[PDB]
Design a protein around this ligand. Sequence first.
Ligand code: QJS
Length: 230
Amino acid sequence: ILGGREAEAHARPYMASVQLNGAHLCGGVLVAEQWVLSAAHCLEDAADGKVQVLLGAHSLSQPEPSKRLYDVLRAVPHPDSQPDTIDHDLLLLQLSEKATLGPAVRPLPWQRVDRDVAPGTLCDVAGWGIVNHAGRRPDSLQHVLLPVLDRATCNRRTHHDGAITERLMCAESNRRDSCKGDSGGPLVCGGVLEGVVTSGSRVCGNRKKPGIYTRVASYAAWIDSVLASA
Ligand SMILES: O=C(O)c1[nH]c2ccc(F)cc2c1NC(=O)[C@H]1C[C@@H]1c1ccccc1
């Protein structure tokens, strides 16, 4: 997160760190007792690397009573995702067992109504991604409040030039933004999950290249079908 601040420890009990061979790779969000939602590019080249999900965390490195690193039974990328496109960039991780819930670990309700968030709505994004242009990695969770940017502005030639489909939404990126390592994490508006940070390479903190987020309401039937797979 560029331009943000340290999050209140455990105030976002749905936040997940998706890890590959014990290192933070991407954000994620606990959406059901046994399932974490994230982005597909995060793992597209992960091969047989060990994927785990850290829940109940603030610090990546320090012990905390609520912190638990879960193994993953199954990783389920969206079947229409592809390397090198921004579309359908969703991934579901089935934990090896249902998460132990409490005040620091709780699924986040997620949007099913497939209608746009009002322009300018202030939404929260959190993560453990880079915090400056040199790439410094924070030990603890950072966050920032970002206003939703209307799709037509986001689609101007000067911005994303028509790439923002109905299944995607934008948030402003002027000096406050999600950056490398924050992808896959949640964009939360009015206490409900609205978007998942896309995980393609994007410049960080340039107002002319807004943040792009996959709209979870647009993928409700897919999320429900993977969960019913259990
Ligand atoms: O976050 C992302 O947008 C993103 N998209 C990807 C696509 C392929 C892919 F193989 C990885 C990624 C990845 N994450 C990362 O590279 C994580 C490694 C970097 C990181 C940055 C700051 C703090 C901790 C760790």
